[PDB]
Amino acid sequence: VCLLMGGSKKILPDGMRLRGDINVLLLGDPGTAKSQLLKFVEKVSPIA
């Protein structure tokens, strides 16, 4: 839920902007929706 909102996109005056987006890693043995949870995200999120 915190991911799809983006974040603090910051056009600093030197141009060295910082990403607003966040990166999340799922790790585990197979099962447990680690692949499934992306599939629904590809429905809800804009331009997924």
CB of 38 to other proteins, least distance (A): 13
26 with 3: CB under 8 angstroms? no
Residue with tokens 């910051």: 10
Site membership for ligand ADP, residue 33 (CB under 6 A): yes
The number of CA neighbours under 13 Å toward the Cβ of 32 is 5
CB of 30 to ligand ADP, least distance (A): 3
Site membership for other proteins, residue 3 (CB under 8 A): yes
Instruction: Extract the annotated binding site for ATP.
Output: 28-35
Site membership for other proteins, residue 36 (CB under 8 A): no
Instruction: Name the strand (E) or helix (H) holding 37.
Output: helix 36-44
